[PDB]
Ligand binder design. Structure first.
Ligand SMILES: C[n+]1cn([C@@H]2O[C@H](COP(=O)(O)OP(=O)(O)OP(=O)(O)OP(=O)(O)O)[C@@H](O)[C@H]2O)c2nc(N)[nH]c(=O)c21
Length: 181
């Protein structure tokens, strides 16, 4: 068995790509790349696509649970929010790619103990103004799920206590931090 079986993941995941094209609506600029559900198929895809730091400003990658679209309007996102990492321009070089890869692993390895079921996906925004990485969760009112997710994530990224990160509800973004760790 071990010698020939690919290792299945807890969830099947979909990677999405966004390219800013002004000719198009935001939703129309969103595009599913591929899905995977094994460790081996994760790395085949990751080793095949551009690093986040190599994307033209305006692009996103999103990794979401199969069946959850990477938009606020999805039933599993409507009432949720995100843990936001705000990077300066100098961190595109030093931290963006390692932070994103760490975030990908937090999701596919189900790293938030029981609250991993609260995770919906992650988004990296490559922006000239400053990049962003975020983990999206399904319910911004689940205090103990959100907070545990936030504390684990912060430690897995290696962020020091001199840093505080904030959690924002999608209902507030679509128009303020609810929690900070
Ligand atoms: C996630 N999302 C983004 N948009 C649209 O895209 C625009 C830009 O949002 P981004 O999340 O790409 O973030 P950016 O850095 O590009 O722009 P910022 O708003 O943060 O500017 P700032 O850095 O504060 O000066 C939004 O204002 C919406 O019009 C969405 N539209 C829908 N319908 N659903 C979505 O889920 C969705």
């Amino acid at each position: 068995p071990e010698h020939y079986i690919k290792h299945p993941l807890q969830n099947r995941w979909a990677l999405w790509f966004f390219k800013n094209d002004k000719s198009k609506t935001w939703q129309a600029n969103l595009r599913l790349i591929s899905k995977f559900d094994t460790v081996e198929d994760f790395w085949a895809l990751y080793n095949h696509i551009q690093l986040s730091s190599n994307l033209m400003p305006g692009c996103d990658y999103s990794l979401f649970k199969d069946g959850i679209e990477p938009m606020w309007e999805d039933e599993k996102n409507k009432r949720g929010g995100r843990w936001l990492i705000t990077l300066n321009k100098q961190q595109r070089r030093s931290d963006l790619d390692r932070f994103w890869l760490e975030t990908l692993l937090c999701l596919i390895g189900e790293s938030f103990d029981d609250y991993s079921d609260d995770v919906c996906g992650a988004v990296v925004n490559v922006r000239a103004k400053g990049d962003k990485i975020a983990i999206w969760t399904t319910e911004c009112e689940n205090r103990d799920a959100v907070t545990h997710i936030g504390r684990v994530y912060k430690e897995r990224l290696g962020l020091p206590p001199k840093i505080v990160i904030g959690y924002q509800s999608h209902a507030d973004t679509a128009t303020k931090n609810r929690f900070v760790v």
